Paper text:
Murine caspase-11 and its human orthologs caspase-4/5 are essential for the non-canonical inflammasome pathway. Their activation requires oligomerization and autoproteolysis. The CARD mediates caspase oligomerization through CARD–CARD interaction.
The crystal structure of the caspase-11 CARD (residues 11–101) was determined at a resolution of 2.8 Å using X-ray crystallography with an N-terminal MBP as a crystallization tag. The caspase-11 CARD contains four chains in one asymmetric unit (chain A, B, C, D). The structure of caspase-11 CARD displays a unique feature that is distinct from all known death domain superfamily members, it is composed of four amphipathic α-helices instead of the classical six19. Comparison with the classic CARD structure reveals that, in the caspase-11 CARD, the classical helix H1 is fused with H2 to form a long helix that we named as H1–2. H6 cannot be observed in our crystal model. The electrostatic surface analysis of the CARD with acidic, basic, and hydrophobic patches indicates that several neutral amino acids in the long H1–2 (residues L372–S391) form a hydrophobic surface, which possibly mediates the oligomerization of CARD. Moreover, the interactions between the four protomers are primarily mediated by H1–2.
Author numbering:
A (entry chain B): 3 to 172, 178 to 393, 431 to 443
B (entry chain C): 2 to 166, 181 to 333, 336 to 425, 429 to 439
C (entry chain D): 12 to 172, 178 to 422, 431 to 439
D (entry chain A): 5 to 423, 433 to 440
Amino acid sequence: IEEGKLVIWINGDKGYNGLAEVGKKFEKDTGIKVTVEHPDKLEEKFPQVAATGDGPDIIFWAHDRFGGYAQSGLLAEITPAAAFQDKLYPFTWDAVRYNGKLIAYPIAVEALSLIYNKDLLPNPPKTWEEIPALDKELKAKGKSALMFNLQEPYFTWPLIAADGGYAFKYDIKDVGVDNAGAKAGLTFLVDLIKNKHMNADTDYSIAEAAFNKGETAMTINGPWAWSNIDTSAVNYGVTVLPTFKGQPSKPFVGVLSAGINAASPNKELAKEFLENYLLTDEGLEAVNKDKPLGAVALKSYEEELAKDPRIAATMENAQKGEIMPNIPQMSAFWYAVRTAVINAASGRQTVDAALAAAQTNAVDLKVLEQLGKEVLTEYLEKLVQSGEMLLQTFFSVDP
Amino acid sequence: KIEEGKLVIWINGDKGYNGLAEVGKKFEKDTGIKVTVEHPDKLEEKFPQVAATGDGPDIIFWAHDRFGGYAQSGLLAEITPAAAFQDKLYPFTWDAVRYNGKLIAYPIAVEALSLIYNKDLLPNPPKTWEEIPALDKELKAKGKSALMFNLQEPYFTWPLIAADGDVGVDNAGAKAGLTFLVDLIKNKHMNADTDYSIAEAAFNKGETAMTINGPWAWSNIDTSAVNYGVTVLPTFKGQPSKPFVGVLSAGINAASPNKELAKEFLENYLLTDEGLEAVNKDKPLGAVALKSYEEELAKDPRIAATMENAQKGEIMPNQMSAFWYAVRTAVINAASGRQTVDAALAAAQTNAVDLKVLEQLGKEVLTEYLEKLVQSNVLKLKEEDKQKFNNAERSDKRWVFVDAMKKKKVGEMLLQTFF
Amino acid sequence: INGDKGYNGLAEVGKKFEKDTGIKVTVEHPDKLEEKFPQVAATGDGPDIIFWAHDRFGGYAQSGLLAEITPAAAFQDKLYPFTWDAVRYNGKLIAYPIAVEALSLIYNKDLLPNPPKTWEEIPALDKELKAKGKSALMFNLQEPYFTWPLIAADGGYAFKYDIKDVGVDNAGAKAGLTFLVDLIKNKHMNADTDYSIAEAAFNKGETAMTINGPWAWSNIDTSAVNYGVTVLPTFKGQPSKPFVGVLSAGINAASPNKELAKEFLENYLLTDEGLEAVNKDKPLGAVALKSYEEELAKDPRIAATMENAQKGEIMPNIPQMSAFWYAVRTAVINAASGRQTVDAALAAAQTNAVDLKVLEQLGKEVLTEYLEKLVQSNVLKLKEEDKQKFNNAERSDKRWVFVDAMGEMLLQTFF
Amino acid sequence: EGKLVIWINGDKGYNGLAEVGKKFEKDTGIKVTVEHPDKLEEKFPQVAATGDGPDIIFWAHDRFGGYAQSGLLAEITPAAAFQDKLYPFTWDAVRYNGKLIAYPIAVEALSLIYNKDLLPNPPKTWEEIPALDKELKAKGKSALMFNLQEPYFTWPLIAADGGYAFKYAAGKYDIKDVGVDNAGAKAGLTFLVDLIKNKHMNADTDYSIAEAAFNKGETAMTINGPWAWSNIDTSAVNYGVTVLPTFKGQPSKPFVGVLSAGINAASPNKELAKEFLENYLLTDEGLEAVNKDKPLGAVALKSYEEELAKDPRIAATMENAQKGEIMPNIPQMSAFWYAVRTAVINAASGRQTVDAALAAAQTNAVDLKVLEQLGKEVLTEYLEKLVQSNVLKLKEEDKQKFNNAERSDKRWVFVDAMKMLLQTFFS
């Protein structure tokens, strides 16, 4: 680790030079050089580059895959002014809340939104319960109402959690698929499949191909999919997700966050650059020019971009949507939802039996996984006397 | 990506891939079957993946070091070599390729360690290990050393370790060889930290009289002058040194509709007095499997020495851990001196069988991990592959799974988290 | 033999089997033979024959203690078909069925002169019997040996005809368990009635009918109740599936006389007076031999014990009672307490069963190599030929060959 | 609280601890009842984890360290002025992690016991043992017989020329530094087994074989502690104990255990002990009344040890304890006991050489405990599935208690929830 200057590590999602273009505004006005770098495999270098104290002082990544950094406790806290915590939506600071204090800075926001063909469906439904009758009307014209990815729990969980449902009780303690409100949401979904308003084999590609070829009226996707539906000429709107039993569908919210290192000796100067330069109207648009940040959580700027109705509804779904879990890497809980949807959609179990078995099949999958990690930890500790070769030694030929 | 009527062959860029191209189109001239010879971005792994989904080479060109993984997964078709064409290939050059009573493919080249000496520093090499310390006695007046080879890899050390004489790496004769190896180190005829880079760099500049290497090194040695000879490895106690012998073979896919014409290329065209030399012109094969034309090369005394060394050597181990790590740290500990030679052998043997225990409880825990994934049908894998998973016996479930996963949602991230 | 069946009653061969043959031999009953012979042949020694309950001989067959047995087609028709499947284990017969045991509906002829033949009569007829201060039916529900007959009454047989995880989530176990729990919500029966609470209810005489086999018969004799026993009620046109325990004679695999054990068991023990002599000391109950069983069937309860066993369920051959008992254990208590739905309780207990049995053999595997390492280091100084025996035993039974070597059993290193 | 309860092993002077304990009719007006349950050291941790048990417990110091990691005890509060009245090395014996744990009572170590009618002056070196046994074998006897099966008896000679169990670093016995493979460990070990291969000793002798042969006059010497003394006074031998012989000029180092006591962590009366201890038990007549019943051997206090030292047997016990060094407190000591012993057996059998049997034993030991922890974890996760499934009907207060306990002792907590499922892994 070095002192005298500040740095930044970002990928090719958002403009690598837009941040540079805002980068030298800092050093032009201050004199502290800010190098801006884009390491290949950023999410795979940081806990490596930081655990010994080296690396950046600040850094950028998402909030959904952020459960590998906070667990090793590295990102230092920030005492932002109350006047600063009032520049972004009050619910944004919870997405980067940990142990009680801060862990990074919100910049923008990402969430699933209801996408509908405006010519096929001029007024999209606001209610899940009215789509089966709507679909029957549309299948007589050769179309389907709603087609989105049923394979990944990321898309299907909002409806399963629509009735009094949410990921955690606030921290594991157990898998969160037990509540009887998920029975109601999962029942409705497996019905849309068994009554043939939906197919259980619909993946992301099939749902995307059906919408831009104009074969379906609605689909579930995020701002990342907006690029490919504009190549097609389908006239589409973007609105809030449909409600169920009166409660709104709440998707997962991914938020890019500007964390800063605890081994970082330029703590404050990193605050001055992010708070007073990056995180206001002038800084983001330098970033937003090279590549769009999507909806940004900064009230000042979001509203002027909220003139785009797609970006405004993307955020509206995010404010209601609940925060992407701090226990992730996509396992445990993720495994219980997916196996519950698959077995119930094919009719092997009623939904009551499916998610009850799928959840204890999840917790007992991770007692096997962590058991296997230990014997291999003991394996690895033995040959220390002398990363994928462990696959051909254990997936070898002989028994 | 499969096809009927073409032959596609894949080989490392180690080997002349142009040579096979040279032999390839001559095939399509006398026949009409257009052949394509590529050396894809690292074929050692890409093959098992694309084998399982059915595509890939019709003929795969490789050694019999790692064909364990290929035959038993069952996607390298069985062979039918006529008896009239048998009787030529060395009695032993198949034993290496013969797996599970049935033949996997046909061997081409044979590669083995050979004692490499220059003729400038000493005219005629010593034929046994025990006299090396005495000859080394007066090669330092000039300032030079007699022998430097790689001591880190068991591939080089094991020929001397087991030169004298489950069972285990700890035996009465393994002491003898190991004891002689480390006593050379304590007298500064050799150093425990000498690796492949140091040993080859010293001989190629000519301050070492003898080395132990294979024909893969001869390219760099030819390029760096040094008038050198190649002979049989030094004897220990009276028993010959037995190096690990790789035979480089030609596997053919089991998903290939053209398996008849795949042989037609290897049998009557590839392995001949002519087409063999065609690939070897651009790539030194060392010794070769055919006999009608192995002895042309045997005029070259360098290639003859490796053949005599290969006929005495063992077949490489085909399982890439345990015993290999036992011999490694047994040599490492005793060479640095911090543990007695017999203390190192005892400590190596218990770490080895404890390595295999810790290894195969992981394989049992692993087999349990995927038995749970197939049952929950998290994958939606075809009902055929799920019952076919449950039909296969316990040890091969791991392979039936991943071939029932390369098919297509992916469960490759579930498995790569397990490690 | 053991001390619960006839030692001398079967030792009376010297007076018959042996005289014709000139082959002197005779039994003796070591006490607590439960887990005591698993190793006298683990040598090649041991007796030629052993009798004991069919509970679990499969653990003593794949480990190589029981050879294949020779019943002729004419001799197999001398015993009931269902008892051959008791000792039939992976396609081979490893023993000779002698006597069998099963549940039966215990009626009494004063409250209800004609007992119910189906299960749906008892909710509707329990009414009559409810009011007057009693109850029509009640039995142990806290251990699945009693609850499984009705739960599995509609559906597949599971064990009669590979053994690992047939599964309890079948739609029939729903109908069985749903009907049973519907009996509790209508208060035809209460959720907390195990063995003694159920027997004391019938031995203090405030319930009409019960479920239990022959081992309890004497307790109803002493308490003044006039009862018989009959066949269990059918559930949805299909008979109930009570667990059929069998007493069978297996003959060792290292035995010297493979065919002399068969010639004696088949033509001398398994004949009318052969099994009789031991039935004189013993109420052998229902016997597998159709010839004599018909004469014991004068007792209408042995005929009912038999009839319930013919269509009954064969006892778990392997160590399945580790997962299955537990699978059908936790499924009932979680469902009867209203904590889970019948469907949620079945699939959970199903998957809870096979994933804890996986942990257990895994714990067996790491312990086996833990104990195996202890004998390679000679830390215990095992008299050597107590240690070749350990190294040459089957990788599974190796952990009990190690107990042979020297009661007291420490190992408390794990606890 | 209100009363004082004592646990002490049944082999000690437990009732001699009542005469001293019944003398509490002074200002304390509090009574004590001494109690001697067997398996006591096993039972205290499991019941004191729930907050019950005696106030003070007399036990060897080696297991007090395994207790205090779980916080089964409480902070000690000795004054530094009275700390000196004991022997300063005994304070390091019970000092654990940087703390105190107990108050020293007795010092216990091995010593050379000889037959004077057979052997008038003992040898002071191990090197002259083989020549002395050569003379006694001519007369039908042997020089030395002691238990070779347990490394506690063989450790003094294996450690003379610079052998140690775990190296004391700062306040801590270095666990990556094992001293059973040091130059003098080998020097002591071969000489131990050359005694066995030259037929001077025999690898089959255990404690029972040695004790009977020594008290029947069949051997001239034996190695034992103060516990075996009374059996030798019943014997017909005129015996005495003395220094242990030196090896290569250095004296042997026997393991020094101290019998001492603690004050329960959740105990309701912690200050009430401290007097019984600090002021009473530990006074000249305090230990005299328990040495009255069953002798304590060497005591940490001076003014009564000095009275005891006039009998040369306890003076030899204390002196052999001075050159000996304290037994570590740490769970890895069992891996030490396993490593040293399997090395002795295979070296005494000629099965392996001494350098070879030592190395094969050491990594056998830690590879064995690797399987132990792996066996404890699959067990721990296995019983978690048993209580979470409610198969054995508990919940009430016994279920969340178990689940809130830290994972490491989710076992002991579970089988003290037995208000049955035993060795099901042997089926």
